[PDB]
Amino acid sequence: SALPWSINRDDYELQEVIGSGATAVVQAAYCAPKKEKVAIKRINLEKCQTSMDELLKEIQAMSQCHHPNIVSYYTSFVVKDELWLVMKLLSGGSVLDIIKHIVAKGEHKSGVLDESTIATILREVLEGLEYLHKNGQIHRDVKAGNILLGEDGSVQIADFGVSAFLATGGDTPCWMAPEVMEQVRGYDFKADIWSFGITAIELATGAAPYHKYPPMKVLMLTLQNDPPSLETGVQDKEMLKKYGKSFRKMISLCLQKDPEKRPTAAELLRHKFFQKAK
Amino acid sequence: ALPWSINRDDYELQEVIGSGATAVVQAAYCAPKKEKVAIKRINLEKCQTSMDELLKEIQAMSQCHHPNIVSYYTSFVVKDELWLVMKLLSGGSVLDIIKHIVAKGEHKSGVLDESTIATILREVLEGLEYLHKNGQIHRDVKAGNILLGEDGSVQIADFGVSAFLATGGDTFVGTPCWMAPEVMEQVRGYDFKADIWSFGITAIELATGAAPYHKYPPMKVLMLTLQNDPPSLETGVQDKEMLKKYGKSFRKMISLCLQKDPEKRPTAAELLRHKFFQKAK
Amino acid sequence: SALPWSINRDDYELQEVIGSGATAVVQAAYCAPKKEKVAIKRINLEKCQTSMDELLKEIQAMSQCHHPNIVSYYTSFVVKDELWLVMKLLSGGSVLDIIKHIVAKGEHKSGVLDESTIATILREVLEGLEYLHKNGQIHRDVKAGNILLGEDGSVQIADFGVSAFLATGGVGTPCWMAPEVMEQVRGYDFKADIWSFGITAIELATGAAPYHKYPPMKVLMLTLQNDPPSLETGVQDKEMLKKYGKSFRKMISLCLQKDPEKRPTAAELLRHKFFQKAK
Amino acid sequence: ALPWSINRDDYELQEVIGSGATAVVQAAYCAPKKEKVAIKRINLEKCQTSMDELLKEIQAMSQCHHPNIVSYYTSFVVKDELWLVMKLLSGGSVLDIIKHIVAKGEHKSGVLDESTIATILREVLEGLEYLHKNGQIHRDVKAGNILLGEDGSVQIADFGVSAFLATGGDITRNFVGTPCWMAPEVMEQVRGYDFKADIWSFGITAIELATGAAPYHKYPPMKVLMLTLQNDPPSLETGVQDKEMLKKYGKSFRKMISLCLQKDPEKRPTAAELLRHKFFQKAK
Numbered sequence A: 001s002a003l004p005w006s007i008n009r010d011d012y013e014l015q016e017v018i019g020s021g022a023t024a025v026v027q028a029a030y031c032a033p034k035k036e037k038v039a040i041k042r043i044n045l046e047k048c049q050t051s052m053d054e055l056l057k058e059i060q061a062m063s064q065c066h067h068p069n070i071v072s073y074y075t076s077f078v079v080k081d082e083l084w085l086v087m088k089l090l091s092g093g094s095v096l097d098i099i100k101h102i103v104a105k106g107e108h109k110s111g112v113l114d115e116s117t118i119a120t121i122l123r124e125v126l127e128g129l130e131y132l133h134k135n136g137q138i139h140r141d142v143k144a145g146n147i148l149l150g151e152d153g154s155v156q157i158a159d160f161g162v163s164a165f166l167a168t169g170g171d172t173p174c175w176m177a178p179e180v181m182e183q184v185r186g187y188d189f190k191a192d193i194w195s196f197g198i199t200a201i202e203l204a205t206g207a208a209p210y211h212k213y214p215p216m217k218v219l220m221l222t223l224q225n226d227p228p229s230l231e232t233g234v235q236d237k238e239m240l241k242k243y244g245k246s247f248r249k250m251i252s253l254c255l256q257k258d259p260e261k262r263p264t265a266a267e268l269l270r271h272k273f274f275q276k277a278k
Numbered sequence B: 001a002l003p004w005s006i007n008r009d010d011y012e013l014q015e016v017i018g019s020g021a022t023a024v025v026q027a028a029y030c031a032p033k034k035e036k037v038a039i040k041r042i043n044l045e046k047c048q049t050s051m052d053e054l055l056k057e058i059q060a061m062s063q064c065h066h067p068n069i070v071s072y073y074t075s076f077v078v079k080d081e082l083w084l085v086m087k088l089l090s091g092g093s094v095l096d097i098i099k100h101i102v103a104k105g106e107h108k109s110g111v112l113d114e115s116t117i118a119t120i121l122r123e124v125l126e127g128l129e130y131l132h133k134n135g136q137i138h139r140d141v142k143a144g145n146i147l148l149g150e151d152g153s154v155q156i157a158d159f160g161v162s163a164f165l166a167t168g169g170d171t172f173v174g175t176p177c178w179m180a181p182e183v184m185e186q187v188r189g190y191d192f193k194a195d196i197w198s199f200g201i202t203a204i205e206l207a208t209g210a211a212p213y214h215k216y217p218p219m220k221v222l223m224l225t226l227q228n229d230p231p232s233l234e235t236g237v238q239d240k241e242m243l244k245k246y247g248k249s250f251r252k253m254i255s256l257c258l259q260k261d262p263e264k265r266p267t268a269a270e271l272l273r274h275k276f277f278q279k280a281k
Numbered sequence C: 001s002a003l004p005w006s007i008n009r010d011d012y013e014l015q016e017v018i019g020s021g022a023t024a025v026v027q028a029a030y031c032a033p034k035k036e037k038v039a040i041k042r043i044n045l046e047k048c049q050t051s052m053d054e055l056l057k058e059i060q061a062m063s064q065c066h067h068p069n070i071v072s073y074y075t076s077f078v079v080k081d082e083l084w085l086v087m088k089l090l091s092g093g094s095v096l097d098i099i100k101h102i103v104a105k106g107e108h109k110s111g112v113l114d115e116s117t118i119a120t121i122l123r124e125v126l127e128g129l130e131y132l133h134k135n136g137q138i139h140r141d142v143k144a145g146n147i148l149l150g151e152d153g154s155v156q157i158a159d160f161g162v163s164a165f166l167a168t169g170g171v172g173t174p175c176w177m178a179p180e181v182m183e184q185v186r187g188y189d190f191k192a193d194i195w196s197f198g199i200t201a202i203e204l205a206t207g208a209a210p211y212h213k214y215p216p217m218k219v220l221m222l223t224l225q226n227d228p229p230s231l232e233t234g235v236q237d238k239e240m241l242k243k244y245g246k247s248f249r250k251m252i253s254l255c256l257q258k259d260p261e262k263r264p265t266a267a268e269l270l271r272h273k274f275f276q277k278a279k
Numbered sequence D: 001a002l003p004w005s006i007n008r009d010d011y012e013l014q015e016v017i018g019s020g021a022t023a024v025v026q027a028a029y030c031a032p033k034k035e036k037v038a039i040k041r042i043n044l045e046k047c048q049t050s051m052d053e054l055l056k057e058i059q060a061m062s063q064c065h066h067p068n069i070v071s072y073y074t075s076f077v078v079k080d081e082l083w084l085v086m087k088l089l090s091g092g093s094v095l096d097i098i099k100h101i102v103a104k105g106e107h108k109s110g111v112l113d114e115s116t117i118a119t120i121l122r123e124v125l126e127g128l129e130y131l132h133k134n135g136q137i138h139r140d141v142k143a144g145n146i147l148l149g150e151d152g153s154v155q156i157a158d159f160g161v162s163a164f165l166a167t168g169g170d171i172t173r174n175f176v177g178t179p180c181w182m183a184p185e186v187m188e189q190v191r192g193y194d195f196k197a198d199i200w201s202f203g204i205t206a207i208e209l210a211t212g213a214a215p216y217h218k219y220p221p222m223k224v225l226m227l228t229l230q231n232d233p234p235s236l237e238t239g240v241q242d243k244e245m246l247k248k249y250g251k252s253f254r255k256m257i258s259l260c261l262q263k264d265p266e267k268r269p270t271a272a273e274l275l276r277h278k279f280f281q282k283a284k
């Protein structure tokens, strides 16, 4: 260990691409000084409608958040018109890959992951989120696809900071309507608690509730309906027999429209459901 | 139609009508027009704002003219200030009347009677319907912004720049399936339906003298309104028998406007047709 | 400011001495680029008989641990023969200051801190220790003197990393090895902090660690030779422990187990009945 | 009268007695002394040590002479090895004997009898007393380090350099402010340890002569650690299934072992006191 991570681009040999969007590439790289194969997220600032002045607070937050249930951020530096984020390489895939695999094998009759694997994975997610919240931070993009698995059996939340920020859009009132009030006050960590309840639905049913709808209809479907439950998007109600009352109550505590009514991650760690974590 | 002057020297400043942090309303004589106007002088610096950020507001102001909307004449910058030149309505506002009644101690069985609320608010709905048809939002509907002409006219003030500053001013690729509702609400905008809520609160204020959460600090008003069911006519009132005279149609009207879900609120055209507004003189 | 702390000595203007010792000097400093008054711990590497090479891992650890219950570490750099540690400046003194004030005034006739005050402060300590333990870290120097209060009401453990490390002294198949030899072979782990935490609760209740009356070399032997201490060990008279009930005493006996495997983790202690007394 | 040579040209290397990663023990003829010796060749690179770290060990070795300690003659570096020149005990070790009895199948109901354990361990205790009263610790007491003379002598091997290396070097070397908040296991480390560590090892060696093996020989090195620190101190029967494999071991032998096997070093007797034990009256 000893020293700080190199901000010299030439200290990193680019290797196999892991994933490739528009326009961010997650590529494996070897860092000789550290003798470690790492993952580099390469974000073209131009293409994301962003800049280094916009992203500074986000990078400062990533430099400060260090916990075993958060993918280690090592360092970041600009390479020409790209921001590079150097992080720990997790070789176990995401929880979403495991979901896609169970579904593709047709093993999802009666449910996708059983109640005790969900308790186990999401307990680790709640420990990471509780740490971020205590630190005055918000993840913003909690989902199965951002829960990464280490070869050591560790569960780590990915994309805290710049990635999540870019994924979620970047950045007396006596007469003022509630929806104006809502945007005036902004939002807080309790937003993660809602996304956490959606993520529980996704691990049980394989998909988020309104997954069948285009992006702008999901916004409306969500706001013009009662909060979703396991039953909202599921293929068949038969898939919901692996799941009992304490899981459903856990989910429904998360999924309240009023953020103040949602429990904190620490209170959730205490829920009856999380006693099933083996 | 003949243009208003944009030269500061054409306007002789007179009585100060209202003075705050950020803004003064002052009477002025405009010699070229031979007309006594009101100027709202806004400190752009104190308001943490610029003419760049205000351009679209000013543009909307210069396009939006209706008998139920205070006449906007012109605007120009003087040193550190944006001056907004508008019609002078010295008869003042519905709030001035409210305060007179409260000051006399004549507010204990209600402030304004049903027929006078219906008359006033009908005119406000005509002004709002005009803005709304035209893709505009007011943002700051309240009694203090309903101005009264000597001739009986009812006109909504502060459209544009002032309602913008008064209320704060202040996507993304992918499917928002995990996004919290309060986050989605901020992402989507808001629209003219927000005025209908402010309208329902204004109805409460005309009858009782005040907004329902008037006794609370600014941040507690946000929490109480976001956390609780909408306020009723009687929330801000200790004598729960005060408004026993105010009937079913008024209360129904207010509860249509005071719905948390904006899609559920009526349009201003729809409210104009409400049974309550048949009470107007 | 979103930028990193400066590692140039000249961006810092050294002011009033906050605290001292034969070893290190803590000074208030203004950092001009950051417009903040910070605290700089200046450790004389010569007088501590250490080196930057012995300490780099400690600083690494400091640079990685960030939690609202651990004093914030900003930066560090070497000036001549001193290691300078730039930290958040806290203005509420320590829990030890409060203890010494209550003791000097003679207000400790039925105990120094109320049970709900001890529960509140120590709950915050246990959140910081649990965080550090989760990250594979050990504090090593848990004590009242290292629990700092912000004038905002926050509770923050001080001296994680270099200072605690310095304050604390920096085969085959072993079938024939004596247990005291095996103990040093194995080193120790985070359960050491849980013992110190248990002594720290005694200190908050009674005003001092249990064997405070004895010289430092006899403390080693006193501890090793006897059953673990309790509230009653270092006190005169049992009416001086009138504030403290059964669950407090049980919490403490759980920490003060000679076998570390038997001590609970900080996470487990947070779930203890005693801590339901926290305001 | 002639000093032991430090010239590698004075030595002829012969049969390899023992090999390993760390060291090779090799017979050798020393020419000016006209004697067949044993040389322990220690690879300093491989052992992650240096002549600087080892000098106080060598000094102790050149000081510590007793009939119950294998004779150290001299030492010198040849290239990357340190050569420890010592008396050749061709009779081999007590562990060679145990291994022979176990390979013959003759270890059921026990390995060495009581009187032969008594005879040997008394000689080890003499050598230990000599070491301890002189401020020395052996650190690697066990059957494999009890070497036998053609003449009946019993001598402890590996005093100094070898025992130091075998037990992990300066890891097991034996601040201002009061240590009031310090955990007992941290205090045990700051205090180091003393000659009483050898009395525990002697206790384990007794079990080994009787059963063939140390109590937790079946376990990986780190399980052994955990076990001995977590559990009660071992006894004669701890790793033995058919407990009738210990019928001819009496009460005074087991009591002797249990005096040795106390977690608290101060409770353990000195080698002097052990010499007076009723069990060592069974020695011939």
Ligand SMILES: Nc1ncnc2c1ncn2[C@@H]1O[C@H](COP(=O)(O)OP(=O)(O)NP(=O)(O)O)[C@@H](O)[C@H]1O
Pocket (backbone or CB within 6 Å): A018, A019, A020, A021, A024, A025, A026, A039, A071, A087, A088, A089, A090, A091, A093, A094, A145, A146, A148, A158, A159, A163, A167
């Ligand atoms: N630190 C990491 N270690 C190992 N794999 C990673 C790491 N970070 C990302 N990945 C994977 O590499 C790809 C990352 O692409 P990315 O640009 O993050 O978009 P995405 O993961 O497909 N969608 P989203 O996570 O919602 O932003 C995905 O296949 C991830 O599962």
Ligand SMILES: Nc1ncnc2c1ncn2[C@@H]1O[C@H](COP(=O)(O)OP(=O)(O)NP(=O)(O)O)[C@@H](O)[C@H]1O
Pocket (backbone or CB within 6 Å): B017, B018, B019, B023, B024, B025, B038, B040, B070, B086, B087, B088, B089, B090, B091, B092, B093, B140, B144, B145, B147, B157, B158, B162, B166
């Ligand atoms: N065109 C106008 N003619 C006459 N009086 C006016 C005019 N506009 C505003 N006023 C009065 O000037 C005073 C100050 O008004 P204004 O700057 O609107 O602040 P406010 O009404 O106290 N609060 P807000 O409307 O939310 O900024 C008020 O008493 C108004 O009644």
Ligand SMILES: Nc1ncnc2c1ncn2[C@@H]1O[C@H](COP(=O)(O)OP(=O)(O)NP(=O)(O)O)[C@@H](O)[C@H]1O
Pocket (backbone or CB within 6 Å): C018, C019, C020, C021, C024, C025, C026, C039, C071, C087, C088, C089, C090, C091, C093, C094, C141, C145, C146, C158, C159, C163, C164, C167
């Ligand atoms: N970040 C900080 N903010 C405010 N005060 C501090 C900070 N760090 C240390 N101090 C105080 O500065 C003084 C001297 O510091 P130090 O040399 O750490 O002495 P100490 O408190 O005895 N610590 P130790 O190393 O455990 O003996 C003490 O009175 C501390 O309480």
Ligand SMILES: Nc1ncnc2c1ncn2[C@@H]1O[C@H](COP(=O)(O)OP(=O)(O)NP(=O)(O)O)[C@@H](O)[C@H]1O
Pocket (backbone or CB within 6 Å): C172, D017, D018, D019, D020, D023, D024, D025, D038, D040, D070, D086, D087, D088, D089, D090, D092, D093, D144, D145, D147, D157, D158, D162, D166
């Ligand atoms: N002076 C000696 N005379 C005769 N044989 C010896 C002498 N010293 C050691 N041996 C034997 O040489 C072999 C290897 O010796 P050595 O490596 O010291 O012992 P070990 O027990 O195999 N290893 P360790 O105990 O881990 O250092 C063993 O079989 C010893 O019995």
Ligand SMILES: [Mg+2]
Pocket (backbone or CB within 6 Å): A094, A145, A146, A147, A158, A159
């Ligand atoms: Mg991912």
Ligand SMILES: [Mg+2]
Pocket (backbone or CB within 6 Å): B093, B144, B145, B146, B147, B157, B158
């Ligand atoms: Mg007005």
Ligand SMILES: [Mg+2]
Pocket (backbone or CB within 6 Å): C094, C145, C146, C147, C158, C159
């Ligand atoms: Mg301190």
Ligand SMILES: [Mg+2]
Pocket (backbone or CB within 6 Å): D144, D145, D157, D158
């Ligand atoms: Mg040997």
